[PDB]
Structure formats: structure tokens, C-alpha cells
Design a protein around this ligand. Structure first.
Ligand SMILES: [Zn+2]
Ligand SMILES: [Zn+2]
Ligand SMILES: [Zn+2]
Lengths: 237, 199, 213, 198, 189, 144, 157
């Protein structure tokens, strides 16, 4: 619905009743501009008028007439309240961070950046470790120990995989890995091993963990070719 | 297969319910006010783990009965897959037929959640040697959960109800020794079709 | 013109009997600049359409210098090229082969008369802003070739009695095949000759075909 | 061919949601801290596979109703190309009519993803034998997806909506037996022609 | 004469799969990854982009009502897509680049595990690893159109919006390849 | 020592007239030439060090007819057998001890394991037959 | 130009390259400089817009944290919480260590974890003061040195 008047566009939508500036008879929710009389002759006093500097002085009159006046990605505030009132302006003395996402732009404080800096610090520290890139038994005894711990699922394919990755990173990284895995917890009493399958008691389970420790310790002193030919038979990848 | 069992349980709380908060950031937000936050949703409703309680109840009773049931409570223990609770709650090669929902309160936070004070007293002196503050769920709060048994059998509802009565006897979560978490259950079950949504 | 071309995207250039050219030839540079020259209205397109104009191949360069002659051995470093560079592509019911990109190749366009330089400088400017597309499946994005360096150095011809490229002389055991596909004429011809083997320039079939090193 | 079906899916979580990280580099970066990371984007938004859940829902419902419907769940099982979910989701030759998008979250990982503690308790001594940290997506977190059906039929939308209510009944993502992944779906459909862009 | 050069900037919103075509590189990669992504020897990512544009224009112009050939049949030579994206004889005016990534492989290409789950048992019946591109990865292309017409930018942009909605590369039905394409046109005379 | 930025400075912000940028690169001492390079750099050299550590008769034809008729001995099987072969055939028949997943194709379960065994037998025997005989045998079954 | 403005210590030797993981700020005479610049610039401009330690040896630090970790005065919760307040600054760490160490006048109960053993009263208070002085002197060190000191005692800091 768009009526006309003396140049006036009166576009009615489902949201609001605009009037681009005789006067109409219905509600003129938004009016766009002696005119005060043109305001005062118009029923259902408009919500917010849309009004070179004389405008502002006129807007002051529109301010005095008790009528709101505007002078010509979604953004969210994660801020505080504080507040102040200086020169008829409600303010906030805050410095922060403008974060740009696909649909939202948010205004975050320095605490969020300290959250992000702690995460990035903890990420960086766990990348470079030590010097990236012993007992002894015979080769065949290493074979039957790895077969026996493979059958009872103490040394599993995942453990062999992380052993090979820590062996490719060098000797000391693999030593650190097996001393972490075989570390008996003083306050808990468990190590980072898969428990064996079978009807066992604590003594032979502890002994089997000890031979797992000694087998993976003595395999580290061998070269990479023997270790690869030792572990492909169990972990083909 | 063609049908699935629906077990709607409605559990009311008789002695105060604690189940601890799991989320590390929600914990670190709440430890400035409460030392023991209760487990909560982001929509401010109380979450309770339910599958582990029913599973542990069934393993305890079926082990005391003498039936072949594995234990999945020991350290890194794996389910064999041939038990009766292994069929209901899963194993390494097969999932559980009984998908067990979280116990979610019908009310919200700040209506059933109440923050309280707990004590530790010297035996020789009778003075409050320590004090902490823990977040509980009031008595009479009503929680609603659903158990969806995908391949129903004749003994599934009896096993689920027996585990529910064991949860009534022992408590559902939290400080169960001190008397927390004593609840009661109301069960409504029906054999719905699998193709009910295919209109 | 002295310059170095980097194959940004790989090129596919088939030949007869099953094989593929191990690097792009000067006939392909001639064809692609002729296509750009017709698309820019520059008056060198009639000279391109002429196939016997001397007025105006791309050999791989080494870790040193240029590879010299299917294998192409380096002169100084003696690094080897060829049959580790061709790669089979099975894509959507087609089986062709290409060259892996990321490898550097020579520039060889030597204008014998000064009168067309400007013209040649102009199309080098187009290459320096857009790139030249050499080989088969040009519109599919294959065969991209950026310029890394550009300069102009005059060259005196050979003052001796080897063939870096190939040559067209009398009757030969080998067989070389090029083509003429004239736009705004609807004509395509896979024209045949025999020529000699490999290992100024001409001799003696064409300007952008013969080389004497 | 002249029309397409657009199904805008807005899904909210009523239960905490877990789906497992798939990228190895992201997963090995995450176990320095957490044991079960949630699958996310490189733009820090949560991603859930969606075509498999809808297809599995339609296969179980259509097998239990009685239609001649193949099963692609078994190991290296071949789709027949004759059933309605072979036409709707894909066949070994013919492509799928429904191009099911991923479930892209509206918020990022700092708003909806929260690392939590899960346990494993001995049944006799009632002590926590094991403990592991796992990320989860919070409840009330919303996700958006778009299902584009080319060459539509009359019953495609009823099938997709029935699969969506089945996903409400069972769950999406992982850890479905423990109570995770229970969701609620809103559907906005529409007919388009393919030449809106033209 | 004039020519039209369209710079296509591409942002990845859902993970991108384009299967590797180099057989020797494939079998070098098959010991670890069962679906290697299409990669260069400069460790960059290749995406075929003339086929997607041509197929998008064929389905859109066929469903509009125009007489366009459907590949999948020889090109006719008289339709709009033969005059734009090529026909057996008349070469296509629109040469379309490969979508080359601005980043290398180690920043954007990740090995990701995919499943096949049994419907009744609800366990992972099968497993495989495929390489995929991360999201927010920016790809670049420039397409060149010789002797352009009035309906030149509009057809390219409409096919570009069809690829935004549908996707590019492989695994299209599973949600892979949902991208956003910025553009930048220029006329070179 | 002289210090060189390999990092990209073409993304910046202006705070307090300071042109600043948050960055997370690694400082590397290199033989009186220090540098600060990105995370990609460490990704590339971690990859380079990993690759450096990685530098170390009628019944037979009727059985192939039955097996290719139910597609357990399919076209890619015939190809990869041609590409080969004893270690291959060992690697495509060995049952996984955890899941029982033989790497063949699906075609009762007893008939399935007999058919799987039939394949291993036929595959092993054809390698016994000399080349060309098998090659011709295999062409009309999967032409490639 | 480059002025690194950071300690070039904590240099591990990945492969054949003495690297050193870092997270800081590039500021343009370009000058890479650490989080202390961002603290200084943030305090400076945040207040400009508002206008309307003990020193004990590193070996003794490590030995005393090991000793108090064995007798459970310093624990993995305390080493993690003190690390969190150390990441929040050198003034939040002072406040946290003072809050833990303080004797509440009514109860007399310090907030430390009590020692495990048979220690008498004066020895218990001496070990509490040892924990106070050790964690007070640890702050005087930089973030990387603090991290390598406490990463042995708590592997998931
Ligand atoms: Zn069991
Ligand atoms: Zn089917
Ligand atoms: Zn056509």
C-alpha cells in the first residue's frame, strides 16, 4: 500500500508505516523530512523522524518537541558496565579486541586474549621436546618377548606405533616414553600399560611389566633397520 | 529389529543429590563460590550419568548371582562380549542395544539447585576444623530419562528394573556413603515400532 | 630473450608411438604466443600463420645451466633428467600423462630483426602479467608457465661446423610431427615430416624447430 | 530437473554432543591436553557428519517397515541401486540426489565446546580406576545444515523428516549409549528452480 | 579486440576433497592414505574448475529452457556452453585455470579418518583414511574469456553461485566442498 | 648476529601508533644468523626429519569364473595380481586376529570362508602357472 | 633492523637446529618483543583512556620443590593453580601465594597442604615458610624457566 500526497510517499509495510515528505489520516510511524505545524497537524505523533548544519539546530527543536530524531555482520559486546556521563554522553573507558567470525563480530576484553595466549603458549611448548631427531638381550629373546606380550595384549599395535614414532625422534625421546609408560604411580599404583589377559596375580603381572620394560629398553640400543624388521611382523603399518 | 523398547523413567530425589561438575571451565568459573559444583547443562538443568550406574548395578548383581558377567570397572578392563550386561550396554565389537539417556531434571537451576555448607570436626576438641561448600539437588526434584533398547529381549525390562531398584538401594551418584543420592524410580515402558516415524 | 619459465601447473604433450615430450618445444611457445597475438590485435599474427618465418625449444635447466641431449644429461653437474618426471593421470575415463610442475625451463625466442622487438616486448609484458599456457588441455588449467626472469641479450650465431633440439633434413629414421590449427579458418592439419635426431639454429624446416648448440 | 528441494535444518542440542576428531594432525595436537577431542573446523566451529546418520536412519526404518531396501552398513557392502535410499542418498553408479551438507555450528569452540572429565569406577571398591578428558558440545548449541535434493520426488521430504525424528530418538555423533547426542530439529523447506542464479 | 579476465578468490567453508590423479604419486601415498587429495609437486592443491562451471551452466541453462547439450554425448557447437566452455571443434573462449591454493600442503591438507558403520551392530565395520583440505583455505584462479559478450560475467557468476550451493571436488553428497567464491573482473584490451 | 624475519609482515594492526602483530613463530639460531620462522616452517622440517628417518588348469579357470561371477576375485584384484606376488597374496588373505576381517570382497558364512579359501588357493596356483598363460587367462576376465 | 628484546635462553636442539618455541609481538626498526610489551602498552593506553622479591638459587629452588612435593606440601593442584596465577601476571601470583601462606588469625590454619610424615610444629612452620620463600623467588624468573622447573613435577601443566 503506497498512497500519495502533495510534494508524499506513504509506503505501508507489515513492519512500520513510513512517510517520505496535505497529510494522511493513519499512523505515520517514521516521518522523513513551519514544518513543526506539519508535525503538529499530523495524528499519532511519529516514533522517530529521519532528518546543512541547520538540521542539527532543527533537530534540537525536534528534541524539544519530545520527538526522537536521527541524523544520517552483527556485532556483540562481551563487555562490563562501569559507565560515566560526560558532555551529555553515556560513556565507557575501555580498550579491547575486535574478533571477526563468519557471521559475528564480537568485542572482547584483554582477559579473553590472555585466555587465548595461555592456550597458544601451552600449544607451542608441546611441539619441540628435548633432542628430537641400556640393558641388552639377544635378538631372538626380544622376538619371543614381543610375541608373548602381543598374545596377552600388553604390547599392542598402538604401543608399537608410538614406540616407533618415539624411536624415530631419537634415543632419548624413546627412553623418556618408556620411563613414562612404566612409571608406577606412587599415589595410584598403576602404570600406563595395557593389563594382560588371563588368570594372573599381582606378582607375575608386575614381572611381565618388568620384562616389557626390559624388552623395550634393550630394543632401543639396536639400530633402526633391526627395530623396523622386529616391529613390522606385529604392526604392519 | 522390527520393534524397540522404550523405557521412560521418572526419578524423584529423597535425600539430597550431588553429582559433580565435569567441565573444567565450568568448574573454574564455579570454584570462586562453590567448592563442589553440581553437574549442570548449559540450559541450567541438572545432568546425571545414568548408563554407568545401571551397568555397574547389573554387573554387581549378576556377579553375586554367579552368572557369566565381565567387569568393566577394573583398570582398562575390556568387555568380552558374551555376557548379559555386555549385550545391553555394549562391548568392544558391538554397541549396547540399550541407549541410556542422561537423567535431566524437569525443573531448572536456581529452583532445585541449592548451595550448602559441609564440615569436618576435630574429635578431641569438637571444633569445625575444616569447612567447604557443595552444591546439591533438593529432595523431591524430578528427573526424566529414556532407555531405548534397540533389539528387545524378554529379560531386558526386568534387568533394567532390577538395576533401578539397586540404584534406589545404593544411590545414583556423588557422595553415596554419606547418604546423598537416595532416589526412587517410576517406570513406564512400551514396545514401540521402529517404523513409527515412517508416515 | 633471456629468461626462466617455471611450470606452475603441469603440461601434457603427447607424441606418436606412445611417448610424451619430456619438456615443451618451441612450436608450442610459437603457437601460444600466436594465440595471444590474435587475441590482442597485434600485427604479428600473419607472421605466425606463416610457418617459414625466421624473423622471430624450451629445454630444462639444471642445478648448475641448461640440460643438454630421451634422457637429457647436465653438462657440468651431470645430473640426469627424464623418465622420473612423467606421471600417469587417470581422470574420469581418460588416461594421459603429464610432467610434474615446479621445474624450471629455458627461454629461447631470438628475434633476428629489431623491427618486431617492441611487439615481442609487448607480448612478454602480457606473459609477465598473465602467463603462457603450453601443451594439451590448455583451457582446463594445464600447462601454466610463469616467468621468473626477463632480459634481452643480443646473440651472434654459431661459428663452427650439436643439435640441442631436432632438425628437418632429407630422409631420416626418426619422425617428427607438428600441426597447424588456424583460428578464423576452421582448418587443422597434423602435417608430417621425418627429420634427423638431436645431439643460427635452423638446419632446416622452421625457425622455431631447429637448433645448433 | 527444473526444480530442487531446499531443506534448511536447524538443530539444537538437548543433551551434550560428542563427535570424534578425524584429522590426525589435529587429534595428535589435541591429546597433549585432551583424550577425546571434538571434531571441529579450522574456523573453530563444530562439524558433525550428517549424511551417514540420515542414511542409517532411513535404512533401519525402511528395513523394519518391509520395503526392499539394501544395507550398506556391513563390511564392504554394495548398494543395490533399486531402493528409495539408493536413489535418495547414493548408489554405486548413480550419484545421490540429496547433497547433504555438514552440520556447521553457529558459535565457535570457546562458546560451545567444553572439556570434561569422564571416569571408570571399580565395582567393588567404588574408586575411580581410570580417568580421561573429553571435549563435548554443550546443550542448546545450534547447528545449521542444508539438504539440496535435485530431481525431487513427492515423498523425499517425508523420508528426510522421518529420519530427522529418528535422529531425535536415538542421537547423532558419538557416545550415544551414554546419553550423548540427543537433539531437536527444525525444518524449513522450500521449492526452488535451478535458475535463481540465472 | 577486448578480453575479459576474471580473478576468482575462493574460501573453503566445508572440507574439500579432490582425488589425486597421479598414479605413481597415488601408489606412493596408498601405503598411508587411501584417498590422497589432488596435490602438486610444489605441494599445492589442484581443483578442476572448468568441469564444475560447465556442468553448472549446463544444468541451469537446461532447466531454464534454453537448448544446451548435456555432457555425460558430443558437444553440439551451437549452444551457449559450447560457445563459452568449448566444443570439439571450436575451442572454448573461456579458458579456466585450475584452482591453485595460496598455501602449501602442510598447512591445509590433513589426513582424516572416515567410517562405515553397521546399522544393527552399530560399530565401525570399515575404515579408511582420506586427505582433505582445511576450511578457510584460500584458492586462486584466473579465467580468460576471448571476444566477450554481454552475457559473460552474469553466466560465470551464476555458475559460481551454483558451485557455492552445490560444492566443488569429490564427496559432494556428504557435505564436502562447500565453498564461497569472491570475484574480481577486469577488461584487457 | 644478524637476525632475519621469514614471517609475513603483510597482516598488521595499529595500536598506540605502534604497528603491531601477534605472532607465534620460532626463533632459530643458525651459525651466526638468527631467524624467526613460522609454524609451517617447523611442520616442514618435522616432515623432512620424519622422511629422513624413513630412509631405511581348467578347474583353476572355472574357479576364477565362479569367483568373478560373484565378484570376490574382482577386477582390481586381477589387476593388482598382474601388478604382481606371494607376499601380496599373503597380505590380502591373512585374517585379522581382532576383527576377523579378511581383505577380500563379500560374495552362508561357512560357504563364505570356503569361497575365501578357494580364492587363496586359485590365486596361489595361477602364480605357479608361468606368465602369458595366466596373462591370457586373466585378460578375458578383466581386460586392462 | 631487529631487536629481539627477549631472553635467547631455553634453546633446545631439534634435529641439527637450536630452535626455541616462542609466542610474542612483532612491532614496527622492526622489534620482536614479548608479552611484557603488551602488558606495558595495555596498562599505558588503558590508563590514558581512563582520564575521563627474594632471590634463592635455581638448584635450591628445584631441590626444595622436589622435597615439598615428596612430603605433599606442594601438590599437582598447587603447582597447576600457581602456574595459572603466574600466567595471569607477577602480581596475581604474589596475591595467590600470600593467600595460601597466610595464617588466619582466628583459626591459625595456613592454606597449604599439610606435610606427610612425623614433622613437629616448628618444622612444619619452617617447611611452610620454605614453600612461601621458594614459590616467592620462583616468580622472579621468566615464564619459560618457571615452565621447565615445574614441568617435571606436574607433567600436564
Ligand atoms: Zn563381558
Ligand atoms: Zn539400495
Ligand atoms: Zn552444446
Amino acid at each position: 500500500k503506497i498512497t500519495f500526497y502533495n510534494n508524499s510517499v506513504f509506503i505501508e509495510t507489515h513492519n512500520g508505516n513510513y512517510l517520505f515528505s496535505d497529510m494522511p489520516d493513519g499512523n505515520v510511524d517514521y516521518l522523513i523530512l513551519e514544518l513543526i505545524d506539519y508535525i503538529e497537524r499530523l495524528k499519532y505523533t511519529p516514533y522517530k523522524v529521519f532528518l546543512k548544519e541547520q538540521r542539527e539546530i532543527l533537530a534540537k527543536r525536534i528534541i524539544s518537541k519530545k520527538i526522537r530524531v536521527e541524523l544520517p555482520k552483527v556485532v556483540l559486546n562481551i563487555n562490563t558496565d562501569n559507565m560515566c556521563n560526560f558532555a551529555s554522553y553515556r560513556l565507557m573507558p575501555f580498550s579491547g579486541f575486535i574478533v571477526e567470525k563468519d557471521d559475528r563480530i564480537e568485542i572482547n576484553d584483554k582477559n579473553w586474549f590472555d585466555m587465548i595466549w595461555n592456550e597458544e603458549y601451552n600449544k607451542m611448548r608441546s611441539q619441540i621436546v628435548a633432542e628430537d631427531f641400556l640393558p641388552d638381550m639377544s635378538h631372538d629373546k626380544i622376538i619371543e618377548n614381543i610375541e608373548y606380550l602381543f598374545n596377552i595384549k600388553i604390547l599392542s599395535k598402538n604401543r608399537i606405533k608410538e614406540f616407533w614414532e618415539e624411536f624415530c625422534k631419537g634415543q632419548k625421546a624413546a627412553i623418556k616414553y618408556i620411563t613414562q609408560v612404566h612409571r608406577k604411580n606412587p599415589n595410584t599404583g598403576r602404570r600406563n600399560w595395557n593389563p594382560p589377559e588371563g588368570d594372573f596375580t599381582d606378582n607375575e603381572i608386575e614381572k611381565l611389566y618388568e620384562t616389557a620394560y626390559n624388552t623395550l629398553l634393550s630394543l632401543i640400543k639396536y639400530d633402526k633397520n633391526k627395530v623396523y624388521n622386529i616391529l613390522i611382523n606385529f604392526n604392519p603399518k | 529389529a522390527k520393534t524397540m523398547k522404550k523405557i521412560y523413567v521418572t526419578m524423584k530425589t529423597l535425600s539430597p543429590l550431588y553429582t559433580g561438575e565435569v567441565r573444567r571451565e565450568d568448574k573454574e568459573a564455579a570454584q570462586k563460590r562453590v567448592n563442589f559444583p553440581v553437574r549442570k547443562t548449559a540450559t541450567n538443568k541438572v545432568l546425571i550419568p545414568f548408563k554407568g550406574a545401571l551397568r555397574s548395578a547389573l554387573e554387581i548383581m549378576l556377579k553375586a548371582k554367579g552368572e557369566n558377567v565381565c567387569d568393566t570397572g577394573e583398570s582398562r578392563a575390556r568387555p568380552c562380549g558374551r555376557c548379559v550386561t555386555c549385550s545391553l550396554f555394549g562391548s568392544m565389537g558391538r554397541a549396547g542395544r540399550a541407549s541410556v539417556d542422561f537423567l535431566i531434571s524437569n525443573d531448572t537451576k536456581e529452583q532445585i539447585v541449592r548451595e550448602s555448607t559441609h564440615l569436618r570436626i576435630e574429635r578431641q576438641t569438637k571444633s569445625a576444623s575444616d569447612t567447604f561448600k557443595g552444591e546439591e539437588v533438593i529432595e523431591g526434584a524430578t528427573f526424566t530419562a529414556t532407555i531405548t533398547i534397540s533389539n528387545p529381549q524378554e529379560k531386558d525390562l526386568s534387568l533394567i528394573q532390577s538395576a533401578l531398584k539397586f540404584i534406589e538401594e545404593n544411590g545414583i551418584g556423588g557422595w553415596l556413603n554419606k547418604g546423598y543420592g537416595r532416589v526412587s524410580f517410576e517406570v513406564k515402558s512400551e514396545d514401540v515400532a521402529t517404523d513409527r516415524f515412517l508416515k | 630473450i633471456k629468461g626462466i619459465l617455471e611450470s606452475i601447473t603441469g603440461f601434457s604433450i603427447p607424441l606418436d608411438n606412445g611417448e610424451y615430450a619430456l619438456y615443451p618445444a618451441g612450436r608450442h611457445l610459437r603457437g601460444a604466443i600466436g594465440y595471444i597475438a590474435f587475441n590482442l590485435d597485434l600485427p604479428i599474427s600473419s607472421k605466425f600463420l606463416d610457418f617459414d618465418f625466421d624473423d622471430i625449444d624450451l629445454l630444462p635447466i639444471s642445478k648448475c645451466k641448461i640440460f643438454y641431449p630421451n634422457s637429457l644429461k647436465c653438462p657440468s653437474c651431470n645430473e640426469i633428467y627424464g623418465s622420473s618426471v612423467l606421471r600417469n593421470i587417470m581422470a574420469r575415463g581418460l588416461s594421459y600423462k603429464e610432467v610434474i610442475e615446479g621445474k624450471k625451463y629455458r627461454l629461447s625466442i631470438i628475434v633476428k630483426d629489431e623491427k618486431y622487438l617492441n611487439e615481442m616486448e609487448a607480448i612478454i609484458r602480457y606473459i609477465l602479467s598473465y602467463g603462457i599456457y603450453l601443451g594439451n588441455k590448455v583451457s582446463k588449467g594445464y600447462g601454466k608457465f610463469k616467468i621468473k626472469e626477463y632480459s634481452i641479450v643480443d646473440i651472434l650465431p654459431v661459428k663452427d661446423s650439436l643439435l640441442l633440439s631436432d632438425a628437418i633434413i632429407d630422409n631420416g629414421e626418426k619422425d617428427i610431427v607438428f600441426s597447424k590449427k588456424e583460428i578464423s579458418s576452421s582448418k587443422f592439419e597434423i602435417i608430417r615430416k621425418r627429420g634427423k635426431a638431436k645431439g643460427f639454429y635452423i638446419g632446416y624446416g622452421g625457425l622455431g624447430f631447429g637448433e645448433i648448440i
